[PDB]
Design a protein around this ligand. Structure first.
Ligand SMILES: [Zn+2]
Ligand SMILES: [Zn+2]
Lengths: 48, 209, 117, 272, 144, 97, 147, 196
């Protein structure tokens, strides 16, 4: 009941019922939560 | 104690220098980060009725550009500040032509003086800070992301690009400790850069209300 | 030091209260219902044991040896009567029961000796 | 341990062993079998008359264990009492000659029970060490790398340094952060309102995000970051903490029908 | 569909033969229980004589309570491990646990070896009676 | 990108959620096109670099050309582009893929 | 107790509790206390002798009922207050033979441990081999079976 | 239906209220048409000062039926016809050789040394009742009625039951002192020896 109107508008932004922007892009990246997977950053944790 | 007092005064001085630099003022590089021993040599190493007393280290700084406006900082002698004490600072300011200033209170301000501070806002702006607020530069904390004050042209560009009004931006309190640190007034969009674990970087905006 | 007890009046049998003598510089117990005075015995009129180092053997009674639900031992004889059987139990009190100290009570009749191991 | 003692709220009650009040009109012939009175015997501090004229005294004996653990001395306690009571009180301590740590307190110049009243007011809130609003603090070495100091070596490889961390039972930032030898950057908190008073709203958004992820992923479950970010952003898209009740949801302009859809229905419509 | 229709040929069950270990495993379980029980008793006799020293950070009673819970948890884990080394690869409890379909290693340990310590509010069974849990036990009995 | 990641992730972990499973897609391409990776490859590394740059141009979260939208697009796909460069670099495509 | 083991004056339901640690002795005659019968252990010997069983098997002939055994001073009703001051033997075949002695100071003996269960928990075969939530759920289902 | 066992003294700890240890006795005489009337014998906690410059110790206070104010224990004992502090201490503390318990009861005894007469004690009992008194008259009788037929009906309701009621109230205060000392453990609300 606190967030039953927070949706993604057609400019890919996240606004509540009164058009106040909660997030500029959904999840701070604009990506939905279904088509994502856990991945390993190979550039991270090497020695120089 | 006397060494504790000079350490506290040096930490307040360092925090004020960092606050002025982050606010966009002329802060000398060695003054921006000086050693405690350097402060003791420059001021006297005895705050207990001695050389590094208050009102000796009233820091006067100008702006990086438009060097006219200054907020030469104030350090009252008494713990509990009052109207008859801030009127001396008002006299010193009206002696000058500069409207901004910061006072560093030791204990809490009397609420009548709190109302008095607002009672001259259009004429000349006065901000107040407690000792505990200036013993740590909160912008250095890992929980505090990068707050950057935006110019009016950038605010217009933002509102024109996103086709939204100032009423629709997520907002921030005027009494926010970070907002008080930058001394932003009402209606002044602040861009916030913070790292995100899902996109790398995220820039949000907080209009002041 | 030691504890301080409540002094009692002799006429109306109320509680006596400490007061000073402006003349002889001595403490006097004085009643408030009547007007009766007594010479003090000690300078200690108030005491407060805060670390709470109490002699638990005073709170132990001998009749607890008759409890069937207390465990007995033939490993520790009584110091006084030499009886080989004695019951052992914990402190059974608050401001306590942080250390598991055994208290022995000899179960021999008409001796009732208790001690701490 | 030194920082641990400098943070924990240490009252006089936690240090004292026992206390009592006496009536010793002649300090020269002290009734409590002490010759340390040589101080008063040769003291030029006001003898009596208007001074130690008070015959009744406060004899409080400290224990050696808590004085050793808290890293305290007799002079520090006497100085704290003098600072907190002005010149109305006189304190004579004991040197490190015996285990019996003696503080003798006299009134300097209601009648006799006032000393007992200040005895209670001295056992309660003297604040010898540490800050207020805090109970016993526990320190430990972390095991999970979230608390372990992750550094980057000169060859670029990460390393997990296992350094001592503290963990309090009360909450007071901007005062622990002011203490020396305390990292003012990574020192987080568990309460959110206290951070909102100290570190602002966006730091509260990050703190709420971390605490919410902590309470969610404690039992090994996983929840995507989109939902945590959205909840922490809706609660902080107003400037202040929007508590999820009627007290926080029904204070924002959303609509009388929307606000009456929540727990309070008639009152919202009447006000609208 | 196809795995169920192969399961018709294969067949899967569970029974009382899947809950019984060989006598050597039972001897190992009983030896471990006896050793842990004697260890708890000797810890108790250390605590009575004030020879137990308090761990820095808590009371003496909790140094005792931590020791007893640590010993009993070690006994439960060791007995569970020694029990789950004797399934012989045909035990249906292992068939369901290894596949992760239903159950865990703890269920196998409790069925075969030992149920373990029973807890109320995160600690042991409190003294509901006067300094004893049940009227069948002597007063002040901190045993397993 | 390595410096940016080490600023972003002070804790030494890289288990991060991203849309396209690039390693699996590379493996799928190997299985579809019958690589036989014992033989020398026949893809030009400059084609790899230019293709990655063009792909990073094609992945659009934020439209527009003004620098504010450019920064928004850069920040929206900062982590994914870092991962895309790391997985689809010239060295790995020439040696292990 | 000697009068309660004979029903001279005090009824069998009335309970005496001697607080030994603190010098108190309380006798409860209220209406609402909940008790249960227990055997009486004089020495490490039960008072339920073989002759009682012989007279109890031949009921409807000797008219030797449960109340006669209560009058014989063999069993008595112990309530919850009195259970705090009783040493209760679980079974006689284990807790009255000499061993490395546990207490050797038993006052009462449980008749049978299966009598701690209710009416619906008594129809469960091998209830101790189950898990307690399963026993509770069966107790819920047992009052629902058709029949 | 379960219920707390009547006519039995219990010592509980309202750790959230202003009382350290609170005693109670849901007194209900058998074969009496009137229901039970619980009397509370509480000790104000305020472990340090009593929010004053003179209130040092903890004061024991009693919540009587049909009386809305916290009546002191000594006031009730004086109202029962026991004027001497020594006699009240005899009825409360049965040993005069343990000064610690006497010292603990000392602040409560020293709260009400102003009221010394049975008449004044009963007048203070009648002050702030569920049915307030008119004057000195008809309020002495109401207080006498409350002390006769409202508190402790299980120890008797008669003219000669003054001393028996005093003995049982002294036992309640003594048990509260034991609970405050820890010499006797606190009572459990779920122990089934405490239920009917
Ligand atoms: Zn008198
Ligand atoms: Zn003996």
């Amino acid at each position: 009941k606190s967030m039953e109107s927070v949706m993604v508008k057609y400019d890919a932004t996240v606004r509540n019922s009164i058009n106040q922007v909660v997030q500029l892009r959904y999840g701070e990246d604009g990506l939905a939560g279904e088509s994502v997977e856990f991945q390993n950053l190979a550039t991270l944790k090497p020695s120089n | 104690d006397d060494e504790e007092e000079t350490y506290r005064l040096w930490k307040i001085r360092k925090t004020i220098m960092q606050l002025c630099h982050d606010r966009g003022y002329l802060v000398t590089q060695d003054e921006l980060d000086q050693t405690l021993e350097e402060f003791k040599a420059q001021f006297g190493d005895k705050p207990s009725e001695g050389r590094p007393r208050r009102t000796d280290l009233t820091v006067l700084v100008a702006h990086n550009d438009d060097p006219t406006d200054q907020m030469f900082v104030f350090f009252p002698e008494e713990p509990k500040v009052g109207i008859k004490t801030i009127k001396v600072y008002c006299q010193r300011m009206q002696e000058e032509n500069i409207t901004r200033a910061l006072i560093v209170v030791q204990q809490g301000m009397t609420p009548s003086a709190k109302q008095s501070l607002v009672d001259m806002a259009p004429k000349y702006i006065l901000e107040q800070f407690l000792q505990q607020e200036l013993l740590i530069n909160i912008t250095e904390h890992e929980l505090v992301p990068e707050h950057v004050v935006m110019t009016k042209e950038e605010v217009t560009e933002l509102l024109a690009r996103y086709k939204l009004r100032e009423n629709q931006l997520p907002r921030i309190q005027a009494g926010d400790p970070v907002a008080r640190y930058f001394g932003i007034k009402r209606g002044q969009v602040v861009k916030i850069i913070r790292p995100s674990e899902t996109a790398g970087r995220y820039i949000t905006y907080r209009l002041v209300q | 030091p030691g504890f301080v007890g409540i002094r009692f009046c002799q006429e109306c049998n109320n509680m006596l209260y400490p007061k000073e003598d402006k003349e002889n510089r001595i403490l006097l117990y004085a009643c408030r219902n009547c007007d009766y005075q007594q010479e003090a015995d000690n300078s200690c009129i108030y005491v407060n044991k805060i670390t709470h180092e109490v002699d638990e053997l005073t709170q132990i009674i001998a009749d607890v040896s008759q409890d069937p639900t207390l465990p007995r031992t033939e490993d520790h004889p009584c110091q006084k009567c030499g009886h080989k059987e004695a019951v052992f139990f914990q402190s059974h009190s608050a401001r306590a029961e942080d250390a598991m100290r055994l208290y022995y009570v000899c179960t021999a009749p008409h001796c009732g000796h208790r001690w701490t191991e | 341990k030194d920082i641990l003692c400098r943070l924990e709220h240490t009252t006089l009650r936690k240090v004292t062993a026992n206390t009592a009040i006496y009536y010793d009109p002649n300090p020269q012939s002290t009734v409590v079998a002490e010759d340390q009175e040589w101080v008063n015997v040769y003291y030029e501090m006001p003898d009596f008359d208007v001074a130690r004229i008070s015959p009744w005294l406060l004899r409080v004996e400290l224990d050696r264990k808590h004085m050793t653990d808290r890293k305290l001395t007799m002079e520090q306690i006497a100085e704290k009492i003098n600072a907190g009571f002005g010149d109305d009180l006189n304190c004579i301590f004991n040197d490190d000659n015996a285990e019996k740590l003696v503080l003798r307190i006299r009134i300097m110049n209601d009648d006799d029970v006032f000393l007992r009243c200040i005895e209670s007011n001295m056992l309660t809130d003297m604040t010898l060490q540490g800050i207020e609003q805090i109970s016993k603090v526990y320190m430990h070495l972390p095991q999970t790398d979230n608390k372990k100091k992750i550094i980057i070596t000169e060859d670029g490889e990460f390393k997990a340094l296992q350094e001592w961390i503290l963990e309090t039972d009360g909450v007071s930032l901007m005062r622990v952060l002011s203490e020396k030898d305390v990292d003012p950057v990574r020192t987080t908190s568990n309460d959110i309102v206290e951070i909102f008073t100290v570190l602002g709203i966006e730091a509260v958004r990050k703190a709420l995000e971390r605490e919410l992820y902590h309470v969610i992923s404690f039992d090994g479950s996983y929840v995507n970051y989109r939902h945590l970010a959205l909840l922490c952003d809706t609660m902080t898209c107003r400037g202040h903490l929007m508590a999820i009740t009627r007290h926080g949801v029904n204070r924002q302009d959303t609509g009388p029908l929307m606000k009456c859809s929540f727990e309070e229905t008639v009152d919202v419509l009447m006000e609208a | 569909t196809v795995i169920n229709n192969w399961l018709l040929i294969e067949g899967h069950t569970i029974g009382i033969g899947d809950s019984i270990a060989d006598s050597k495993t039972y001897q190992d379980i009983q030896n471990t229980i006896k050793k842990a029980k004697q260890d708890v008793i000797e810890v108790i006799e250390k605590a009575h004589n004030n020879e137990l020293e308090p761990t820095p950070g808590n009371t003496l009673r909790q140094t005792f309570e931590n020791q007893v819970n640590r010993i009993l948890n070690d006994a439960r884990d060791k007995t569970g491990s020694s029990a789950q080394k004797s399934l012989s690869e045909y035990n249906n409890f292992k068939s369901m646990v290894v596949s992760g379909a239903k159950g865990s290693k703890i269920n196998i340990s409790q069925v075969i070896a030992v149920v373990g310590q029973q807890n109320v509010e995160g600690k042991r069974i409190p003294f509901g009676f006067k300094h004893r849990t049940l009227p069948h036990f002597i007063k002040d009995d901190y045993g397993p | 990108d390595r410096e940016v990641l080490r600023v972003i992730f002070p804790t030494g972990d890289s288990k991060v959620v991203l849309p396209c499973n690039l390693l699996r897609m590379i493996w799928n391409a190997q299985k579809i096109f019958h690589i036989n990776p014992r033989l020398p490859s026949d893809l030009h590394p400059i084609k790899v670099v230019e293709g990655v740059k063009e792909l990073s141009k094609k992945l659009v979260i934020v439209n527009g050309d003004d620098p504010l939208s450019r920064q928004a697009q850069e920040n929206a796909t900062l982590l994914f582009n870092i991962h895309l460069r790391s997985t689809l670099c010239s060295r790995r495509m020439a040696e292990e893929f | 107790r000697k009068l309660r083991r004979q029903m001279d004056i005090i009824v069998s339901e009335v309970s005496m509790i001697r607080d030994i640690r603190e010098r108190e002795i309380r006798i409860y005659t209220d209406a609402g206390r909940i008790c249960r019968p227990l055997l009486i252990v004089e020495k490490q010997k039960l008072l339920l002798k073989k002759r009682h069983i012989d007279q109890l098997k031949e009921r409807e002939y000797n008219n030797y009922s449960w109340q006669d055994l209560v009058a014989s001073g063999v069993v008595e009703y112990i309530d919850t207050l009195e259970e705090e001051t009783v040493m209760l033997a679980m079974t006689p075949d284990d807790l009255q033979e000499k061993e490395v002695a546990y207490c050797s100071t038993y006052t009462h003996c449980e008749i049978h441990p299966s009598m701690i269960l209710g009416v619906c928990a008594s129809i469960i075969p091998f209830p101790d081999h189950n898990q307690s939530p399963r026993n509770t759920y069966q107790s819920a289902m047992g009052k629902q079976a058709m029949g | 239906q379960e219920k707390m066992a009547t006519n039995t003294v219990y010592v509980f700890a309202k750790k959230d209220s202003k009382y350290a240890y609170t005693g109670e006795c849901r007194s209900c005489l058998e074969n009496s048409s009137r229901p039970t009337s619980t009397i509370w014998v509480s000790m104000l906690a305020r472990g340090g000062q009593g929010a004053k410059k003179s209130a040092i110790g903890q004061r024991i206070v009693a919540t009587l039926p049909y009386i809305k104010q916290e009546v002191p224990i000594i006031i009730v004992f004086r109202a029962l016809g026991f004027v001497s502090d020594r006699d009240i201490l005899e009825h409360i503390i049965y040993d005069f050789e343990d000064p610690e318990m006497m010292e603990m009861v000392k602040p409560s005894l020293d709260e009400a040394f102003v009221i010394q007469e049975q008449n004044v004690a009963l007048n203070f009992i009648g002050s702030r009742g569920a049915k307030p008194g008119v004057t000195k008259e008809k309020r002495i009788k109401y207080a006498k009625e409350v002390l006769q037929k409202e508190m402790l009906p299980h120890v008797g309701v008669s003219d000669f039951c003054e001393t028996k009621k005093a003995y049982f109230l002294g036992y309640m205060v003594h048990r509260l002192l034991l609970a405050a000392l820890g010499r006797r453990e606190l009572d459990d609300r779920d122990h089934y020896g405490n239920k009917r």
